[PDB]
Amino acid sequence: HXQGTFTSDLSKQKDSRRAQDFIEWLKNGGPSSGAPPPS
Ligand SMILES: *C(=O)CC[C@H](NC(=O)CCCCCCCCCCCCCCC)C(=O)O
């Protein structure tokens, strides 16, 4: 009861992770990394 937008309150956590993972991949190298992207 209370709270709302449950899928968003999970999405922010998956986005912090996926975004930090994607920023890691770009920071680390991006297409130049060679590692496929976190996807
Ligand atoms: C949010 O989406 C977190 C998970 C996400 N992974 C993926 O998107 C890939 C698919 C993961 C499927 C996991 C299914 C687990 C089923 C239950 C297993 C119970 C037994 C386990 C025994 C060891 C991510 O980004 O990490």
Burial class from Cβ neighbours inside 10 Å (0-12, 13-18, 19+) for residue 25 reads middle
d(CA 2, CA 36): 41
Q: What spacing in Å lies between the alpha carbon of 25 and ligand 1's midpoint?
A: 21
Per-residue H/E/C for 15-31:
HHHHHHHHHHHHHHCHH
Q: What spacing in Å lies between the alpha carbon of 35 and ligand 1's midpoint?
A: 21
Which residues does 33 contact at the CB level (< 8 Å), separation at least 6? 25
Phi, psi of 26 (to 5 degrees): -65, -50
Q: Tell me how the structure was determined.
A: NMR
Q: What spacing in Å lies between the alpha carbon of 17 and ligand 1's midpoint?
A: 14
The H or E element spanning position 7 is: helix 6-28
Q: What spacing in Å lies between the alpha carbon of 24 and ligand 1's midpoint?
A: 21
Contact assessment for residue 22 and residue 37, using Cβ atoms and an 8 Å cutoff:
yes
Q: What spacing in Å lies between the alpha carbon of 38 and ligand 1's midpoint?
A: 15
